[PDB]
Design brief:
Shape: globular
Bound molecules: zinc ion
Oligomer: monomer
Number of helices: 8
Largest sheet: 8 strands, parallel
Radius of gyration: 17 Å
Number of domains: 1
Length: 227
């Protein structure tokens, strides 16, 4: 039985650019383009997965639909609530944001709040782990990697009354120690910045993702997501 594959899209910023952002090439996706990408996925019959569904699918090697996708957003930026979330609701799409818990605990205005996450969880959104302070985990000792990955999970689990199962490593950096620790902390899924469609063979704690480029037309994105 052929191993299943799952496109895991990696978004970051989605908002209208500031005057200074237009002066230099960057990676911010225009909201209108995000709308058009989701519209095309919906028309093509894509099923939008939660983290729990990705784990089940990869573990049992079966997809809940012919076309599936895991929409992921890193860094728990406020534009996910102000811009991305309304557009996701418009298309009845589910998505995951990987949260830097320290910025939320410190009250950063640039980042998602607990109240916003509680609202979004009731309309399809999931909030997973992106460490407490967003260090390069690879350059941290085993004890520090444990703290960064554990204390943030405990925060999301308690404050959002959940069992966090997925982590995104900051900047996609990890070593053997990172993955051993993530497993011992009862993470089920881990996502990297290694480009490609994902499958169990990547390593469940080291899954590929598809980087969303700002020049990425909906037609070309969908072709990239095909196995
Ligand atoms: Zn900006
Ligand atoms: Zn990050
Ligand atoms: Zn490295
Ligand atoms: Zn090592």
């Amino acid at each position: 039985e052929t191993p299943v594959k799952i496109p895991i899209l990696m978004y970051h910023a989605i908002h209208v650019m500031s005057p200074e952002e237009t002066a230099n090439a960057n990676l911010i996706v225009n909201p209108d383009l995000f709308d058009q990408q989701l519209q095309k996925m919906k028309d093509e019959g894509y099923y939008f997965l939660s983290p729990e569904e990705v784990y089940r699918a990869l573990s049992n090697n079966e997809l809940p639909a012919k076309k599936v996708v895991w929409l992921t957003f890193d860094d728990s930026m406020i534009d996910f609530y102000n811009v991305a979330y309304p557009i996701l609701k418009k298309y009845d799409a589910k998505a995951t944001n990987n949260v830097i818990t320290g910025l939320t605990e410190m009250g950063s205005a640039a980042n998602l709040t607990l109240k916003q996450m509680k609202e979004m969880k009731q309309v399809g959104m999931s909030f997973q782990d992106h460490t407490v302070n967003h260090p390069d985990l690879e350059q941290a000792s085993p004890d520090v990697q444990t703290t960064e990955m554990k204390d943030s999970k405990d925060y999301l689990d308690k404050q959002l009354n959940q069992n966090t199962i997925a982590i995104a490593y900051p900047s996609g950096r990890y070593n053997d120690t990172t993955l051993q620790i993530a497993a011992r902390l009862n993470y089920k899924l881990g996502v990297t910045t290694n480009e490609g469609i994902a499958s169990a063979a990547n390593g469940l704690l080291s899954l590929n993702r598809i980087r969303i480029l700002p020049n990425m037309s909906p037609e070309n994105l969908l072709q990239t997501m095909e196995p």
